[PDB]
């Protein structure tokens, strides 16, 4: 009985709906009656063209602000090069108006879309914090298609204020259910960058989203890491189609590319899911993604089955998002139990790294305590080590059930001698596994060079339920 979009460019939005059955299955969700009505999404970027013919209808002032110039108007700053078109393109992916004879449509074409202008100026900690913490009780979902530079040699994450914003958000946002923070995993693929060296994507408070090309391959710009949760389509080679969305100066573009285009789609799908069940917590949302994401069709050299029978890849997480499956499962979903946290300091003495280091440890996952965990969610391996050439290192974490998470792959461009100072490598691959048993940490020198260093701290942090 459902009538699909009549927008001129909808037919070119292959990722939303397609005969080829190689899409995000969004139409299936619309058919179930979900279009994002009543949900507020904010794009933290370089601004939003609120008067764009395909955005005005859904624009929400209450979900917008200009942190760069300190005013409530997020209108982009126009320039010959059109530098500030990025935010507008992302916004259109989420909530471009439907059936209005203009361009295409957003995943959640009935959702309210706002924008925070915060990338066009000096991006300080305070800037990020005010953006991430803007109207926690009005805005449901925050989408961020930006982050630390992808030079493949830096390790960076949010500063104090930003962290506090993330924490206040998942604790108090949406009346206690927690703000949903969707993040783009990164474009450092060509520099062999690792998204676990990015504190924003690596955070358990954000759903890090990777990309897949139209033909189902890992894009050239893609970064691999164990913190990524799921994937959505984006650009690839010149024979593969790209993302169709709203462009600066009230235009329509068919060439929105890179990791930037993936997060917004995820945000849109999550918006449909919230409409299907407004009582979902920030953790419930991550559970839904893990359970409904599809590997099938996506090609990767590292698909592996975790302890609970699910396929995971460091390039795709649990696979492609399935809007239809998301809204379906959302309806009968029972809120998960309170989040427990189990801290386990492993080392009783420093360990020399040398060519290879292996650390084994049998844990009881807080058995007998109030924070005992039998069903794992996120897991962090907080490491503190020194090394002469950081990029030569490769770190792996093996769960008791045999799931092997690569916390850090070699980064040839990383010649830093500063090692890692209590960096929290995170993995989503052992989600739902029983964390008790023997955990194994592997640190290896992937180079022929005679490198040297010392591992001084290895704290295992388990999040989950019983």
């Amino acid at each position: 009985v459902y009538q699909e979009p009549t927008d001129p460019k909808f037919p070119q939005q292959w990722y939303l709906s397609g005969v080829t059955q190689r899409d995000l299955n969004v139409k299936a969700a619309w058919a179930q009656g979900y279009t994002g009505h009543g949900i507020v999404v904010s794009i933290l970027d370089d601004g939003i063209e609120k008067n764009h013919p395909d955005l005005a209808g859904n624009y929400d002032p209450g979900a917008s602000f200009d942190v760069n110039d300190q005013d409530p108007d997020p209108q982009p700053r126009y320039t010959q090069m059109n530098d500030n078109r990025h935010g507008t393109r992302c916004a259109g992916e989420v909530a471009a108006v439907a059936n209005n004879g203009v361009c295409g449509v957003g995943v959640a074409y009935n959702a309210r879309i706002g924008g925070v202008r915060m990338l066009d100026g000096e991006v300080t900690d305070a800037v990020e914090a005010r953006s991430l913490g803007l109207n926690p009780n009005h805005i449901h979902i925050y989408s961020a298609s930006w982050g630390p530079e992808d030079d493949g040699k830096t390790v960076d994450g949010p500063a104090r204020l930003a962290e506090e914003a993330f924490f206040r958000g998942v604790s108090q946002g949406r009346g206690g259910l927690g703000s949903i923070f969707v993040w783009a995993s990164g474009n450092g693929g060509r520099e062999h960058d690792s998204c676990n060296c990015d504190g924003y994507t690596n955070s358990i408070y954000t759903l890090s989203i990777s990309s897949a090309t139209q033909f189902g391959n890992v894009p050239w710009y893609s970064e691999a890491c164990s913190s990524t949760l799921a994937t959505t389509y984006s650009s690839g080679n010149q024979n593969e189609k790209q993302i169709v969305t709203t462009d600066l100066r009230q235009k329509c573009t068919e060439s929105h590319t890179g990791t930037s285009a993936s997060a917004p789609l995820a945000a849109g799908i999550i918006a449909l899911t919230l409409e299907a069940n407004k009582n979902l917590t920030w953790r419930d949302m991550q559970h839904l993604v893990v359970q409904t994401s599809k590997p099938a069709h996506l090609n990767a050299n590292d698909w592996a089955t975790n302890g609970v029978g699910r396929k995971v890849s460091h390039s795709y997480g649990y696979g492609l998002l399935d809007a239809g499956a998301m809204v379906a499962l959302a309806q009968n979903w029972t809120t998960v139990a309170p989040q427990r946290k189990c801290i386990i300091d492993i080392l009783t003495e420093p360990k020399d790294i040398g060519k290879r280091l292996e650390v084994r440890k049998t844990v009881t996952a807080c058995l007998g305590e109030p924070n005992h965990i039998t069903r794992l969610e996120h897991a962090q391996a907080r490491l503190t080590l020194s090394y002469n050439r950081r990029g030569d290192l490769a770190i792996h974490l093996v769960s008791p059930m045999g799931t092997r998470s690569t916390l850090l792959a070699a980064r040839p461009h990383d010649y830093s001698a500063d090692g890692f100072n209590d960096w929290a490598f995170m993995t989503t691959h052992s989600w739902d596994e029983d964390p008790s048993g023997e955990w194994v940490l592997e640190i290896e020198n992937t180079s022929e060079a005679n490198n040297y260093g010392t591992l001084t701290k290895f704290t295992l942090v388990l999040y989950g339920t019983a």
């Binding site: 990025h86 991006v123 982050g147 930037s260």
Partner: peptide
Amino acid sequence: XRVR
């Protein structure tokens, strides 16, 4: 830093 921070880049698009």
